[PDB]
Amino acid sequence: GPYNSPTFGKSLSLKVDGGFNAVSINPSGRDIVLASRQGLYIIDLDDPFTPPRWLHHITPWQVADVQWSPHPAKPYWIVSTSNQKAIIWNLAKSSSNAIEFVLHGHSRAITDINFNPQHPDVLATCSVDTYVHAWDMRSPHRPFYSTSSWRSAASQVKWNYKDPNVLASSHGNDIFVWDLRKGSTPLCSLKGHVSSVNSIDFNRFKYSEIMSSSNDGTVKFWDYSKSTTESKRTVTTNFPIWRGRYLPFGEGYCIMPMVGGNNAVYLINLCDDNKKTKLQPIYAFKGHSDRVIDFLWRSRHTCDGDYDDREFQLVTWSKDCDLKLWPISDSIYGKVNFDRGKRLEEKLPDYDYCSYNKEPENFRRLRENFVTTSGLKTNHITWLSGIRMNIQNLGEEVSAIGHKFPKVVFEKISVSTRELCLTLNGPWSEENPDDYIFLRISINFPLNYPNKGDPPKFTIEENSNLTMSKRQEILSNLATIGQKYTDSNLYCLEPCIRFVLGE
Amino acid sequence: VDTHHTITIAFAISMDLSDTSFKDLTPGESLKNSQDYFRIVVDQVSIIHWVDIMETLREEFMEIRKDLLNKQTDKGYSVANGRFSPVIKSNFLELVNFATTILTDPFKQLDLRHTTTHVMIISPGSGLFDVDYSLLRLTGKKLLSLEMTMDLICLSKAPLHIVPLFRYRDFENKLHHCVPLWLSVFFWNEWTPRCKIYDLQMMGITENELIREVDVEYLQLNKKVKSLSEFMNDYDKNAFEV
Amino acid sequence: ECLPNSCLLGVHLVISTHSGPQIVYHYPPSNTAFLTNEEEDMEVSAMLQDGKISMNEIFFEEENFQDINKILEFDNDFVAEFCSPEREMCNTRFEFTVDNFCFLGLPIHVDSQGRWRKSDLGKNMNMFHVCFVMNPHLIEYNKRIDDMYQFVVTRLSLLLRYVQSKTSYISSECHIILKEKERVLKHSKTYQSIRGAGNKGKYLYQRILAKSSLARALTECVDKIQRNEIACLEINDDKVISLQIPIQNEFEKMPNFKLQPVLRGSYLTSILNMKFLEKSDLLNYALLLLDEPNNIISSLETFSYQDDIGTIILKHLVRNIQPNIPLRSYRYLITDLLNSLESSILRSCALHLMYWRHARIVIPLSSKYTYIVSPLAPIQGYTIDDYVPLIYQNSMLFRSKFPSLPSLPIFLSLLSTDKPQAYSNIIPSREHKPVYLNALAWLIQYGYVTQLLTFINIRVDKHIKMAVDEDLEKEFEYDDPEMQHDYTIILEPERATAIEKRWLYRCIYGQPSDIQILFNKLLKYFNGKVPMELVIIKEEISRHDLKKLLNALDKYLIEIHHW
Amino acid sequence: GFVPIHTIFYSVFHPTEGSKIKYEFPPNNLKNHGINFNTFKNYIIPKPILCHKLITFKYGTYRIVCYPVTINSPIYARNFFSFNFVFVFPYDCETSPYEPAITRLGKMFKVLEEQNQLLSKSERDPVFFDFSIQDLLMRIFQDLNNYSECLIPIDEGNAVDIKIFPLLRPPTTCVSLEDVPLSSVNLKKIIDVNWDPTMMSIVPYIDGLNSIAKISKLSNSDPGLVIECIRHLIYYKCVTLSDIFQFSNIYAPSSLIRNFLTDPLMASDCQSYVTFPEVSKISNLPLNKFLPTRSCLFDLYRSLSQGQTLKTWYESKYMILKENNIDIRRFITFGLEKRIIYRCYSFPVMIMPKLSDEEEGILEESIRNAETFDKICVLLSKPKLEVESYLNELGEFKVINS
């Protein structure tokens, strides 16, 4: 289920090195995908201690956007841009070959990709070569719709939530609204922006409302049923805006800066009656020493659906290689006109909460054990250093000890299952005191570790080089150290390891 | 050099009207279904107006994609359709005959300030053109009867073959190669890549889908060999044949 | 690229004063097209006869000459303008590219107080810049510039800073260079009697090099770095500096011959200098001189000036050296000259010889070791880095060095036409043994012959597994096929599990105690990575003991043979 | 892959206050990072000798790439106009993919300033004489930092179209006639209309066992153009050279023979590769007249040795390959492709029908160049035994299996 998650009501920061430029989220709220030039990183948002699944695709050009498929019947699909082609990833497939099919459309780099909310098998791609192509995932070979602006490179493409064949694209200073049955001729051309428009977003509730954001600091709200020229509202900021989007709950919108603006995501209420105003946000998500490059939302709700009681968590990804989860308080839920608890006109969709970070797997061949697997993990011990649940964690303790002792080799680190298996060379030989014996110690932690009365369980693998009396003495001293350090409700894994080898 | 010319710049477009991929095109055969366009950008204009000439050229080149690839449907809207032909399958002899239209009559109006009629063809290819045989014969017979020098200039690197190269299919579907005498090829500019592989330079093929399918063979026999040593001897004897 | 290419085109000497920056001495005065594609006469004649002046005559030919006032299509004042940066861009890395020419240097500027170092031209000068011009390709630019700056420019500029701070040496060198330029251009009638601007510049440079010591240092540095050699430079007649760019001629894994070119004669061994230079026991190995001992003595006398204790010790070690005996046995050569201090001196001298292309490190050569012909043997190619062949040149050298031995083709065919056995099967008699070992050292030092080391991995069949299952139970079935074994290679037996360590210790079941003892001491090295030649040296065992364990354990031991 | 731009700024030479920065994205990025423009202002706007050249210099931890442009015309004040579109990168990267982009940006703006006086009129101040810069710099910065591409229209006919391409190593010149090419990709599906006709002819004959001389004779092609086409395919990292398979060859294990053990997919691919699809007839021939296990394949790969030819190795181990249905050519090819074995080349150094004059000339030239048996066999189009007999007729020779 989604309600036993440990990261939804809490704030959490993860350090994901590698230079990732794009991010997208599962609508179930379980997985988050990060795209780079080397491929995809899938992180479990309920088990952030596990290192993310790397799916390999090496490209020299920087990736633009990644997008999860919101189809409930296809929850294994990820569309990611690989320069001029979009790659659909099958997470049920193995990591060596996880690519299902590739959309070979535009000639220049794909700029943005979006899914149709009404029909989640329809995808629209925009690119630098001044083309917006609409694809069908049932027949992913040629686009069923092509349109162009013919002058300026596209920046985003977005679908209309209400009318399921209207999509808009932003090409420099101009926003063009396309009808899918009207060819390349636009329904309207919003031309009120001075500088280049970065982000575009439709309204989920109104048929004909679009918000825009540009480099001049202006956030413009449009209603193309009334007038193509001019705007219903114009909000001016002191910073350029990179991504501006409407809120998924209540009446409001969320914009974030491009190069300045204290690198904080801004949340602004939208509840009022041309109005050149300034930005008056409610909440600013302070943090993020370098600029934020995308923001997402994490939604969970009841499975059956009688009242609209859903909680939201903001997920932001920044240039300083930090992935942060932001809790949203009920003060924000009330300041935005959001009716928490309401009889549903239509029940909310239900998504499977299955993770995808784990590696999947399925003349004749004889059954054989050719080479030993044990003869065949510093990435894990460096990944666990970047996990911060905002020594206060088991994984932070494990990473600190792994950084403290480079000689100690970890064979199995599992913070989620609280099981540790580490190998070392210890001076515990009865024949010669100078001889070092290879030892395998498996450590099991309780769910109440490190509270008082809940010590870790130490099991040492049966070694021929280790005598039974010395093994029992080592185990008894390890139990003594664990009981003595859990009596003060401190952490006992560094005194134990420093006892086994050395003092 | 303080030359006083009259430039005349015209675009030259061949549009492919079929949905067949360009990889399926046979070398030597031209496109069966095509439409040919001609956008005259700058007319007979003196070269002291080179600022206006360049301005018009840049504006019309930026507008040619909207002009051609946005066809008008009778239902009241426009559909983004159409494709430019490749250089090899382009309408090169049609372009040259379009050029030689203006010299058919010796007794035309006299340009009393200018003397020579020189035609330059700017192409993004490398001197390789698939042409029709009868049109090639007619183009040669026409170019040998008038005072023009078609100076083809290629914006790609010089290839590994002799330029200009024309490939045509005869009446018996026989491939031929010929170098025309009347066309002179210039190139506008340590190892330099002189062979064009577009799908590997642009990385247009995803790494999981161009993995090698056909491998080394399975060492077929001879039906004359009864010993393994005889097989090794017959393989070593024929290891360098052909 | 593994082929050595020092991409120098020349050197500058750009100094600055309160009146403004200028240039002092630049070399060579050649054009871009060649580089890219009275008593003074008696003194210069004696210096050319004695070898004190080492210039390159091709830089002053008529087709390979540019004017002294022009450097690479730039004026002297122009170069002195853009190679004399501000105080914020001085005392740091000066990287500056003009298209394909990189102007790399470390300019030294005096501080605000007026001291060169933190501990006419003597007071006016506030900056000097020994600027090096390189033309590397764009794909190897970072590598070439980084190696040049790390190995030549920084060291030479720091030593020049020290000698200027303690002696004011560059000021005097600039003064005598400018005085000799004025005395040749405006006083000597020999200059006017010499035809051709190139020959005039050659005579002018001969006088400058005769009178100046910094000019000799810069000329030798450029000439011996462009020739890919060690540049020994004389500075202030009291200190010498040795400069080189290291050569990649050692390879553990075999490089691709027909995709990445590698110097012919490169050492395809698993024992490398760079595995030991980067660590700075080495005394378990033996040295192997890269030239004749007298040539090494002649080269090492130019590495110092006063014949100190280090040069005497190094000369004594080079004179009394043998490649068949380890360096640990050479403590007696320096105990008479004065863990342990002698072991440290031996280690430092071995690093000094093997870093400066004098004495390569090898496993000590024996007639009991199997020696194969390297794939990187210098057979093809006119020279080492070409890309009469090298086989015939080295055969002539082999015949000259050993006239009582079969030819180099005979030796290289006797070692590469049968299965590779020990080297003692080529030597006919014991009287021929030392000259054949000298031939073996010659073959290894030329890259013709490498060593075939033995690597052992441990393998377990179904019988050991069934015995271990029976022992575990202590505390199909209608047929018995003997060609359906269930085998298993324990890759690293040190980090073996509980069942796999039982497999290893059931492999030795009925063997005697010496086999039991030797298996336990050598089990951790049975991983396919440790050569058995190093195990014999380190563990103080003999070859008869090791050959017993290979014979007594035949179906369980994997034999792997590579370099 | 490609380094992000740190700061883009447009510096212009004012006729009154000299060289100055006009626009700079990000705003105040140079002063925040300690970069002082007055230290290197004489390189951004240098003398006209250094102008129209790609100037790159190091300033602290940053590498500053610029293409200074100076236009001499009497329309401007002081008879010249100078600008520079300057790019700042970190020092510890490779700015080589960005240098043609900056050079072409400077050249295109030089053309535009010489044509319609774009940058000089964009200042809106009549002191330089006798579209927004800041928006263009923002668009260039974020499009090259987010897409490695840009299409930014600046006029009705002008746009900034920049695509950053990776730099590739040049192919070697060591490719020869005796080398066989191995295509690592499916070359039939890469063929579009822009390919060279020679390469299109070569493609259906790169089967992993044809020599370059054999490919040249099969495709009716001159060997030099085949060498250049194989070089071009090497440049795109799709063809790797190998050796002609003969049973007179000598193969030995390399230092990477342990990679047959420490690899999760090498041995399984070996099992699926080296085996005949059916019970082949070679697995029924005598020596004279389930899939194979990975241990069998490893034991066969170790048993190769120097100085022992493949005929001797195969006649010593032929029941093993017959019972396990192993193709020896496929076995050797898989071993060479994974670089776990190598070939020891045979060198005929010196101390039957009448051979032709050109044939004896190329034989003598091959002998005097110490060429391998493979190259002589390719050049004479003869097997090894005929070459050996002709060499024994010509003189006495020894063979090195290096």
Residue numbers in the entry:
A (entry chain Q): 8 to 280, 286 to 374, 383 to 396, 400 to 413, 427 to 539
B (entry chain W): 318 to 506, 515 to 567
C (entry chain U): 3 to 39, 364 to 445, 525 to 685, 743 to 800, 814 to 862, 888 to 975, 1059 to 1146
D (entry chain S): 7 to 136, 195 to 353, 431 to 492, 565 to 615
Text lifted from the article:
We used a series of masks and focused refinements to improve the resolution, yielding maps at 2.8 Å and 2.7 Å resolution for the core and wings, respectively. Npr2 and Npr3 consist of an N-terminal lobe (N-lobe) and a C-terminal lobe (C-lobe), which interact with each other and are connected via a linker. The N-lobes contain the longin domains and are far from the SEAC core, whereas the C-lobe heterodimer faces the Sea4 β-propeller domain (II or III). As detailed below, the Npr2N-lobe also contains the catalytic arginine (Npr2Arg84). Sea1 is positioned at the edge of the wing and uses its SABA domain to interact with Npr2, whereas the C-terminal region (Sea1Cter), comprising the SHEN, the DEP (which is not resolved) and the CTD, is more flexible and does not interact with the rest of the wing. We could resolve an extension in the Sea1SABA that becomes partially ordered and inserts between the Sea3SIP β-propeller and the Npr2C-lobe, interacting with and wrapping the latter. The interaction between Sea1 and Npr2 appears to be stabilized by the Sea3SIP, as its β-propeller is positioned on top of the Sea1SABA–Npr2N-lobe junction, forming a tripartite Sea1–Npr2–Sea3 interaction. The Npr3C-lobe plays an important role in organizing the wing relative to the core, as it is sandwiched between the Sea4 β-propeller and the Sea3 RWD, in addition to contacting the Npr2C-lobe. Npr2Arg84, the GATOR1-equivalent catalytic residue located in the Npr2N-lobe, is solvent accessible and positioned opposite to the core–wing interface, far from any element of the core or the Sea3SIP. Our structure thus predicts that, as in GATOR1, Npr2Arg84 rather than Sea1Arg943 is the catalytic arginine and that the SEAC is in an active conformation (that is, binding of SEACAT to SEACIT is not sufficient to inhibit its GAP activity).
